[PDB]
Structure formats: structure tokens, C-alpha cells
Amino acid sequence: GGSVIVIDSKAAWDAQLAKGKEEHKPIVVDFTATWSGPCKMIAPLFETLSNDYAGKVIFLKVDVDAVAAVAEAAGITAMPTFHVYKDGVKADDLVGASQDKLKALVAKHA
């Protein structure tokens, strides 16, 4: 919900990366899995952050099992993994469900 945009395909991924270029907003992505306890724990915070930073940062969700080709291309091997994209390319990351480090990652780029 909120401002978290669910990515279902490479085409949708590419469209959102292009939108970030046009809007000059960083994109933060949660590469996540439904079966992962840490992922479930932090997904609500990812959503509230998406609302708090609406207008400054774009938030995407990629389920690594439903969009495996995108997650594989992005090198995801543990979940949650957060990436930041700027100008279409990877700029920063965080591996693991750390609420404090996720808040810090978003603030750094907003």
C-alpha cells in the first residue's frame, strides 16, 4: 500500500528506473520474499517511509521469487536487500532487516 510500487516484470522495472531519471528522484527498492521473517518484519516500515518521503524518493517492491530475472540481474542473494538507484544505476545498498539502517539509507538519499 501507500507509495510502495509493486514491480511484476523487467518491463515495469525499466519503466520505474526511467521515471526516476525524469523526476530526478532516487529510487529505493526492497528485494523481498514472502517466506522471510525479517522481510515480513520490515515491510511495514518500508511502506511508512514511502509515505513520509513521498515527493522526494520513489519506493519499489520486488518479490525475488515472482520477479526472479530482475532479482538475479541485481545480484540478490539474501533478503531483504535494499538498493538505491539514481540516474538509472545502482548507487547504494543495505542487506538485512535493520530498521535503523533503512531509515538512515532513505534519509541519506532524500
Residue numbers in the entry: 1 to 110
What does the literature reporting this entry say, word for word?
Thioredoxins (TRXs) are small oxidoreductases that contribute, in most living organisms, to the control of cellular redox homeostasis. Indeed, they reduce disulfide bonds on numerous proteins involved in several processes, including antioxidant defense mechanisms, photosynthetic carbon metabolism, and protein folding. In addition, TRXs have been suggested to control two additional Cys-based post-translational modifications, namely S-glutathionylation and S-nitrosylation, by catalyzing the reduction of glutathione-mixed disulfides (–SSGs) and S-nitrosothiols (–SNOs), respectively. The redox activity of TRXs relies on the presence of two Cys residues in the conserved Trp-Cys-(Gly/Pro)-Pro-Cys (WC(G/P)PC) active site motif.
In the present study, we deepen the structural features of CrTRXh1, providing the 3D structures of both the reduced form and variants in which catalytic cysteines were mutated. Regardless of the reducing activity in which TRXs are involved, the N-terminal active site Cys (CysN) is responsible for the first nucleophilic attack on oxidized targets. While the subsequent catalytic steps underlying TRX-dependent protein deglutathionylation and denitrosylation are yet undefined, the reduction of protein disulfides implies the formation of a mixed-disulfide bond between the CysN and a Cys on target protein.
